[PDB]
């Protein structure tokens, strides 16, 4: 149970830290001896996971530590603490560096001994020690490739990155938007259709898009698209996977590789 590390890649970890907080309360920190797997999924969260909320999307982001030292003795440790406390702590560290390295330690309920200086700052965030049997029930979704099609989204730093980001967020200017009906046709054209207003709106993209490897369609919610937009803003290598009336997967990566995978299920049937 000896877990100690001094994380300094900082953006890669920060985006996960923020997106798990924005997704739902608390998060899972799977500290393997090689790879850290932050798992914000609804199956493991005891307040209306899908009771009237419909919050089904599961995030499986992996953070590497080679961040100064990775001493995971046990060696898989799986934890669960609220995202509010670590969000505040990270924000404080970010502001401090805006003005040393944060040492992290571990004390089936424990605490995290975050310690950093400029002043002395100690934050003992409560945490638990979810069991191995409970860990085994936390498995990543399996996604078929029989129809799954992926769209290589352009990097944000490129000329078309800002235009694509604006096109992605274009669906947020109508406050009566709940369901987004993605469309992808084969040079592939990616289209967004809205069918909940008095007029039939189709937000298309005529720019250059690459399809790494039949119209595939999937209807998702608007908040899922918001977090997808935030992820696209925070990453360069972003792949949009679209399963025909099954699911939508947002694959992000940072060049071993700190991949971020968001699995979004259909919020309706085509």
């Amino acid at each position: 149970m000896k877990l100690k590390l001094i994380v300094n890649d900082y953006k890669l970890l920060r985006t996960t830290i923020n997106t798990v907080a924005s997704l739902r309360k608390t998060a899972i920190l799977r500290f393997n001896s090689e790879r850290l797997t932050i798992i914000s999924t609804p199956k493991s969260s005891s307040n209306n996971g899908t009771i009237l909320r419909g919050d089904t999307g599961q995030l499986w982001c992996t953070i590497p530590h080679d961040f100064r030292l990775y001493t995971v003795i046990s060696n898989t440790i799986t934890m669960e603490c609220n995202c509010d406390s670590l969000l505040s702590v990270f924000k404080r560290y970010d502001r401090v560096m805006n003005q040393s390295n944060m040492t992290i330690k571990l004390q089936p309920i424990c605490a995290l001994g975050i310690t950093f200086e400029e002043i002395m700052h100690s934050f003992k965030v409560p945490v638990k020690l979810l069991f191995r049997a409970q860990d085994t029930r936390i498995q990543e979704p399996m996604i078929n490739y029989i129809q799954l099609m992926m769209y290589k989204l352009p990097p944000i730093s490129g000329e078309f990155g800002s235009a694509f980001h604006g096109f992605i967020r274009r669906v947020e200017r109508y406050s009566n938007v709940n369901h987004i009906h993605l469309m992808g046709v084969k040079d592939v054209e990616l289209k967004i259709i809205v069918n909940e207003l008095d007029w039939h709106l189709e937000i298309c993209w005529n720019g250059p898009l690459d399809s790494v490897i039949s119209t595939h369609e999937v209807i998702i919610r608007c908040k899922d698209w918001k977090v997808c937009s935030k992820l696209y803003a925070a990453f360069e290598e972003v792949v949009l996977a679209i399963s025909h009336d099954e699911s939508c997967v947002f694959h992000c990566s940072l060049d071993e590789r700190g991949q971020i995978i968001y699995y979004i299920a259909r919020s309706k049937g085509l």
Binding site: W199, I203, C204
Partner: protein
């Protein structure tokens, strides 16, 4: 496509739409499609009617491949169009090429906004048609006055500021160059 019109001077169609707002703001709008140009007609309470016309010369492309009928009529609501273009004009500073389209009876009125990166497409639902009887007889004119726009706009603004529950117009030209034209108002001031 039985009709297709493309333009980049979207300010002209914007002024056309803002000149159609005074005639009620949530009701039906008649659009007449002919070879000469694009016209919007609105009628209120059978007492007043407006008729704007966008000529072919305002669009680089104006096909009108329809051949069975010389003119095409469609009825679409104005609140839908206003609410759409209101949020579309958020980034109007971009180089937008508007594209009007209509495939005939039973097909929606399309309004595509392409910025060379995003091609927003809207299909407006067309409603049944309920507008010429309200036209003056060309052989019976009692007075014909040509007035400058700014002066008339100022007079109308003044009449609005005075209230002007009722209005009167005068047209007398005496023996000499005594052209008298006045806009009398029955307002709170008297």
């Amino acid at each position: 496509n039985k009709f297709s019109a493309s333009t980049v001077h979207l300010e002209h169609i914007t002024t056309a739409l803002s000149c159609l707002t005074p005639f009620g703001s949530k009701d039906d709008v008649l659009i007449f499609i002919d070879a000469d140009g694009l016209s919007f007609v609105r009628e209120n309470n059978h007492v007043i009617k407006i008729q704007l016309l966008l000529s072919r010369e305002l669009f680089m492309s104006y096909s009108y491949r329809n051949e069975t009928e010389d003119h095409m009529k469609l009825c679409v609501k104005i609140n839908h169009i206003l609410d759409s273009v209101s949020v579309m004009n958020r980034n109007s500073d971009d180089i937008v090429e508007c594209t009007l389209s209509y495939d005939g009876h039973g097909s929606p009125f399309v309004l595509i906004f392409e910025d060379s990166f995003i091609s927003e497409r809207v299909e407006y639902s067309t409603y049944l048609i309920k507008t010429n009887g309200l036209e003056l007889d060309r052989e019976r004119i009692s007075f014909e006055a040509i007035i400058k726009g700014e002066a008339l706009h100022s007079a109308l603004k003044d009449l609005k500021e005075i209230g002007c529950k009722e209005c009167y117009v005068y047209a007398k030209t005496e023996a000499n160059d005594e052209n008298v034209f006045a806009l009398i108002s029955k307002s709170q001031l008297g």
